[PDB]
Symmetry: C2
Subunit: 92 residues, 2 copies
């Protein structure tokens, strides 16, 4: 209900939703929707991968799930998607 949505919980749920989509996008060759979801998160939030899934990030990059210009080294110097999700809900 509008007026009762908790910030910590919604941020947790969005991070979980993202992690679910990323895991499926990597493992499921027919997961056209999951791949589209993570591509949209990555482009919208300017991120690639998450801190809970660091061992996946190179597979994520290889399979063109991150925006142009994203690469292994450059991504190490960027915040991960979970931090970007926190920033969104915190207004930073």
């Amino acid at each position: 209900e509008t007026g009762f949505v908790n910030k910590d919980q919604i941020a947790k749920d969005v991070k979980q939703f993202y992690d679910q989509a990323l895991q499926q996008a990597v493992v499921d060759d027919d997961a056209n929707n999951a791949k589209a979801v993570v591509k949209t998160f990555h482009e919208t939030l300017d991120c690639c991968g998450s801190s809970t899934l660091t061992a996946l990030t190179t597979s994520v990059l290889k399979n063109n799930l991150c925006p142009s210009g994203s690469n292994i080294i450059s991504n190490l110097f960027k915040e991960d998607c979970h931090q970007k999700i926190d920033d969104l809900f915190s207004g930073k």
Copy 2:
């Protein structure tokens, strides 16, 4: 343990709507501006009066693109698009 796409999209729209209300009347202005800039939108078709205030109070980013699609691609649509992968 799965987060349902429709439920989380609904929750995020409600989170935005509350921030919009609070901003027009805390950190609500920063939250609204962040949503607007990140999602490339500036209000909601369901909250037209609040949308007017956003435009009068510089809480919306620049672009003919934003304005041409003010309600055609509003923040609720952008939130839907985020969770649906469009």
